[PDB]
């Protein structure tokens, strides 16, 4: 930004286990849940800036933990409602995506989240 007072755009990447692993059925969904972390943080971290004026690190992961909360059940009752046995659901396109990235994810920041731990169960050279 030229003006340097606003506009602070925004996007984020998708992950590298994805290419050794031929499909993923859900992975839109994933793909909207990082989409979704990141802008939900980033409303947070300027709410905490805003309130402010370490501290602001893990304020921004309460309100993105709680908004990610919802939809992390919500997507687990719909990827539960479906089955891998079925010929409809094979021919069209599931409990790796929901792990692995948040594997990756945990051990991210030092300031730990409310739900961090909890999702246990509660559903490469140069």
């Given at each position: 930004?030229?003006?340097e007072?606003k506009?602070n755009?925004?996007?984020?990447?998708?992950?590298?286990?994805?290419?050794?692993?031929?499909?993923?059925?859900i992975?839109?969904?994933?793909?909207?849940?990082?989409?979704?972390?990141?802008?939900?943080?980033?409303?947070?971290t300027?709410?905490s800036?805003?309130?402010?004026n370490?501290?602001?690190?893990?304020?921004?992961?309460?309100?993105?933990?709680?908004?990610?909360?919802?939809?992390l059940?919500?997507?687990?009752?719909?990827?539960?409602?479906?089955q891998?046995?079925?010929?409809?659901?094979?021919?069209?396109?599931?409990h790796?995506?929901?792990?692995?990235?948040?594997?990756?994810?945990v051990?991210?920041?030092?300031h730990?989240?409310l739900?961090?731990?909890?999702?246990?169960?509660?559903?490469?050279?140069?």
């Amino acid at each position: 930004i030229e003006i340097e007072e606003k506009e602070n755009q925004d996007y984020t990447a998708v992950s590298q286990w994805q290419l050794k692993k031929f499909l993923s059925p859900i992975y839109q969904p994933e793909f909207e849940d990082w989409m979704m972390i990141i802008l939900d943080s980033m409303l947070k971290t300027k709410q905490s800036y805003l309130k402010l004026n370490e501290d602001s690190v893990e304020n921004s992961l309460n309100g993105f933990s709680h908004l990610f909360s919802k939809p992390l059940m919500k997507r687990v009752k719909k990827l539960f409602k479906n089955q891998q046995e079925f010929i409809l659901d094979p021919q069209y396109e599931s409990h790796l995506n929901v792990k692995n990235p948040l594997l990756e994810l945990v051990k991210s920041l030092c300031h730990v989240m409310l739900l961090s731990k909890s999702t246990i169960l509660e559903i490469s050279l140069v």
